[PDB]
Amino acid sequence: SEFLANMSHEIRTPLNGILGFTNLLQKSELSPRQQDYLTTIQKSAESLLGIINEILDFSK
Amino acid sequence: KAEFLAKISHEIRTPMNGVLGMTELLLGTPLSAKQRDYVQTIHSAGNELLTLINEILDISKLESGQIELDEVQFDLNALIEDCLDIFRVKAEQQRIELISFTQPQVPRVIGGDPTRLRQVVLSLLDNAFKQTEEGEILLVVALDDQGETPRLRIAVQDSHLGLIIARQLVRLMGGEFGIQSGSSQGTTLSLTLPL
């Protein structure tokens, strides 16, 4: 199915950007709560990137 | 298959709202100008991405018989003119001449699903600018009496996953959705609906 592949790619590109900026923020000067708030974003975004990886093989 | 997408888009929605919620709280805590720029960028990209996902879930629910369309009287021109104002600001960042032209015989008020029709026309406009470079984008609202009862025609010509969702909506709306293109005339996306 081409839709799932298109949906995955459409989601992946912003998603790597999210992770990219999240990483950058993690390297910066932030409080533990901020860092903790960031760790949840990373976890959620990484989990989301795991799902769309399934979808992209599922289409295959 | 419609329930398979709805299940997928659901699984994808939950972590997304997790990201946005966290960014929302981050925006409320002390941040440097650069940090806030990063967080604001994560928040903008996150919302655009949640919007698409919700539109994917929305159409899947509609095709799974799980929800239905809205049928209410509603000011067509106001809707059209609300969508064009969303793209005015981008027609002058992207040196584009955005024009509109509603026909004489078109009624002001019609019945249908306003919020989802708004999604459709915005999707055709979004496509249009992304395919156009310093040209003209022409949105036309007209009537199409070909096929017994008179029918509303909304077309956007210019000089793609949201467009697929837009086409499914038009079909559930009992309409047709077509694509025109000529070397001299540019590409035209149109959607003919019942009145």
The whole-angstrom separation of Cα B195 and Cα B192 is: 10
Asked whether the beta carbons of B185 and B172 are under 8 A apart, the reply is no
Q: What is the CATH number of the domain that holds B143?
A: 3.30.565.10
Closest CA to A9 of A52, A41, A43, A42: A52
Tokens of B135: 């040209």
Q: How far is B59 from chain A (nearest CA, A)?
A: 14
Interchain contact, A48 vs B16, CB within 8 Å: yes
Task: Tell me: do B30 and B91 sit in the same domain.
Answer: no
Asked whether the beta carbons of B134 and B94 are under 8 A apart, the reply is yes
Rg (CA), chain B: 19
Domain closes at, from B13, B43, B66: B66
Q: Half-sphere exposure (CA, 13 Å, Cβ side) for B155?
A: 20
The whole-angstrom separation of Cα B134 and Cα B155 is: 20
Q: What is the CATH number of the domain that holds B23?
A: 1.10.287.130
Which amino acid, one-letter code, is at B96?
I
Task: Tell me: do B7 and B103 sit in the same domain.
Answer: no
Task: Tell me: do B53 and B99 sit in the same domain.
Answer: no
Asked whether the beta carbons of A8 and A59 are under 8 A apart, the reply is yes
Asked whether the beta carbons of A48 and B15 are under 8 A apart, the reply is yes
Domain closes at, from B17, B40, B66: B66
Task: Tell me: do B78 and B47 sit in the same domain.
Answer: no
Angle between helices B114-131 and B161-172 (to 10 degrees): 140
Technique employed here was X-ray
Closest CA to A48 of B118, A7, B176: A7
Tokens of A14: 């912003």
- Chain B residues with CB inside 8 Å of A44's CB? 15-16, 18-19, 22
Task: Tell me: do B170 and B112 sit in the same domain.
Answer: yes
Interchain contact, B35 vs A25, CB within 8 Å: yes
Task: Tell me: do B60 and B78 sit in the same domain.
Answer: no
Asked whether the beta carbons of B106 and B76 are under 8 A apart, the reply is yes
Is residue B154 classed as helix, strand or coil in its secondary structure?
strand
Please give the DSSP secondary-structure letter assigned to residue B150. Answer: -
Task: Tell me: do B12 and B51 sit in the same domain.
Answer: yes
- Chain A residues with CB inside 8 Å of B18's CB? 40-41, 44
Which amino acid, one-letter code, is at A22?
T
Per-residue burial over B9-26, b if 16 or more Cβ lie within 10 Å, else e, is beebbebbebbbebbeeb
Main-chain dihedrals φ then ψ at residue A39, nearest 5 degrees: -60, -35
On whether any CB of chain B is under 8 Å from the CB of A44, the answer is yes
The whole-angstrom separation of Cα B50 and Cα B47 is: 5
- Chain A residues with CB inside 8 Å of B29's CB? 31, 33-34, 37
On whether any CB of chain B is under 8 Å from the CB of A56, the answer is no
Task: Tell me: do B105 and B183 sit in the same domain.
Answer: yes
Considering its fold, how many domains does chain B have in total?
2
Task: Tell me: do B80 and B168 sit in the same domain.
Answer: yes
Task: Tell me: do B9 and B54 sit in the same domain.
Answer: yes
Domain closes at, from B66, B88, B115: B66
Q: How far is A56 from chain B (nearest CA, A)?
A: 12
Give one word for B147, left, alpha or beta, with left for phi > 0 and alpha for psi -120 to 50.
left
On whether any CB of chain A is under 8 Å from the CB of B163, the answer is no
Mind giving me the DSSP string for B12-70? Answer: HHHHHHHHHHHHHHHHTS---HHHHHHHHHHHHHHHHHHHHHHHHHHHHHHHTTSS---
- B95: containing domain: 74-195
In terms of Cβ atoms closer than 10 Å to its own Cβ (0-12, 13-18, 19+), residue B163 is middle
Task: Tell me: do B121 and B52 sit in the same domain.
Answer: no
Main-chain dihedrals φ then ψ at residue B82, nearest 5 degrees: -75, -35
Question: How many CB atoms lie under 10 A from the CB of residue B60?
Answer: 23
Q: Which helix (H) or strand (E) holds A32?
A: helix A32-58
Residue whose tokens read 């989301």: A48
On whether any CB of chain A is under 8 Å from the CB of B51, the answer is no
Asked whether the beta carbons of A40 and B18 are under 8 A apart, the reply is yes
Count of A-B CB contacts under 8 Å: 74
Closest CA to B195 of B108, B112, B74, B118: B112
Q: Where are the beta strands (DSSP E) in B54-174?
A: 72-75, 97-102, 109-112, 136-144, 151-158
Closest CA to B41 of A49, A31, A23, A18: A18
* Secondary structure, 3-state, B86-100: HHHHHHHHCCCEEEE
Interchain contact, B16 vs A10, CB within 8 Å: no
Task: Tell me: do B137 and B176 sit in the same domain.
Answer: yes
In terms of Cβ atoms closer than 10 Å to its own Cβ (0-12, 13-18, 19+), residue A25 is buried
The whole-angstrom separation of Cα B152 and Cα B5 is: 31
